[PDB]
Amino acid sequence: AKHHPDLIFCRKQAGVAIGRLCEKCDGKCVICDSYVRPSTLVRICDECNYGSYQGRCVICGGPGVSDAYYCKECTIQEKDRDGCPKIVNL
Ligand SMILES: [Zn+2]
Ligand SMILES: [Zn+2]
Ligand SMILES: [Zn+2]
């Protein structure tokens, strides 16, 4: 999370690529880490989808087994409207 100073939200325009979650993170919200009920499918930007992290867990980088969602509280607070929710290093 950030917290960290070199870490931040990509927030680039999301495209058609769908964020994933590993077995460990399944059900968890990409933004708040809660298990509030899933509300909207996570999409990531073309750059976050490229490379080593492709198809990997959007939260931890583990092997993706299911699609990531924003929870209902997050969609109410409009956290899905900011763009790509992946944490990046910069
Ligand atoms: Zn949430
Ligand atoms: Zn991104
Ligand atoms: Zn994970």
Numbering used by the authors: 2 to 91
Reproduce text from the manuscript describing this model.
We purified the WT protein and determined the crystal structure at 1.8 Å resolution. Our final model contains residues 2–93 out of 110 total. PHF5A forms a mushroom-like structure with a triangular-shaped cap and a stem composed of antiparallel strands from the N and C termini. The cap is formed by a left-handed, triangular, deep trefoil knot containing three zinc ions and five CXXC motifs, which are permuted between the zinc fingers. PHF5A contains 13 Cys residues and 12 of these coordinate 3 zinc ions in tetrahedral geometry. The remaining cysteine was mutated to serine (C40S) to enhance soluble protein expression. Interestingly, PHF5A incorporates three different types of zinc finger. Zinc-finger 1 (ZnF1) folds into a gag knuckle and has C4 coordination from the first and fourth CXXC motifs. Zinc-finger 2 (ZnF2) is formed by the second and fifth CXXC motifs. Zinc-finger 3 (ZnF3) is formed by the third CXXC motif from helix-η2 and two individual cysteines from the loops connecting the first and the last beta strands of the mushroom stem.
The SF3b core complex contains several spliceosome-associated proteins (SAPs), including SF3B1/SAP155, SF3B2/SAP145, SF3B3/SAP130, SF3B4/SAP49, SF3B5/SAP10, SF3B6/SAP14a and PHF5A/SAP14b. Here, by integrating structural and biochemical approaches with a modified chemogenomic strategy utilizing structurally different splicing modulators at permissive dosage for resistant mutation(s) mapping, we report that PHF5A, a core component of the SF3b complex, is a common cellular target of splicing-modulating chemical probes, including herboxidiene, pladienolide, spliceostatin and sudemycin. The full-length Rds3 protein was recently observed in the cryo-EM structure of the spliceosome Bact complex at a resolution range of 3.0–3.5 Å15. This structure shows that Rds3/PHF5A is a central scaffolding protein, interacting with Hsh155/SF3B1, Rse1/SF3B3, Ysf3/SF3B5, U2 snRNA and the intron RNA. In summary, we identify PHF5A as a key node of interaction for small-molecule splicing modulators.
